[PDB]
Amino acid sequence: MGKGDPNKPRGKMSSYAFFVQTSREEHKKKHPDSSVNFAEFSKKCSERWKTMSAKEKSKFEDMAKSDKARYDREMKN
């Protein structure tokens, strides 16, 4: 609806975005000569994120809501 703005801030994030952001940071540790683009990796992380349970996904859902609520106390109230 309205993410990129000229002066206003941007939208919020989510747990699905932190998954590829945290899974990509743990790739260079064992992938110095490997091209892991977003699709070449987001395709594999989706197979695990879709099978992951609430016991593991909770670690990403708690980090996404922490920033998602911060946007409510920025332009409104």
UniProtKB/Swiss-Prot annotation:
Please list the disulfide bridges.
S23-C45
Output compositional bias ranges, type Basic and acidic residues.
Answer: 52-76
Residues the record lists as Phosphoserine modifications: S35
Could you tell me which residues carry N6-acetyllysine? K3, K30, K43
Start-end of DNA-binding region: 9-77
Positions of transmembrane segments: none
Query: Residues where Cysteine sulfonic acid (-SO3H) occurs?
Result: S23, C45
Compartments, record wording: Nucleus; Chromosome; Cytoplasm; Secreted
Entry remark concerning the domains of this protein:
Both, HMG box 1 and HMG box 2, show antimicrobial activity.
Q: How does it assemble?
A: Interacts with POU2F2, POU2F1 and POU3F1. Component of the RAG complex composed of core components RAG1 and RAG2, and associated component HMGB1 or HMGB2. Component of the SET complex, composed of at least ANP32A, APEX1, HMGB2, NME1, SET and TREX1. Directly interacts with SET. Interacts with LEF1.
Question: What family does this belong to?
Answer: Belongs to the HMGB family.
- Protein known as: High mobility group protein B2
Source species of the chain: Sus scrofa (Pig)
Which portion of the entire protein is included? Answer: 1 to 77 of 210
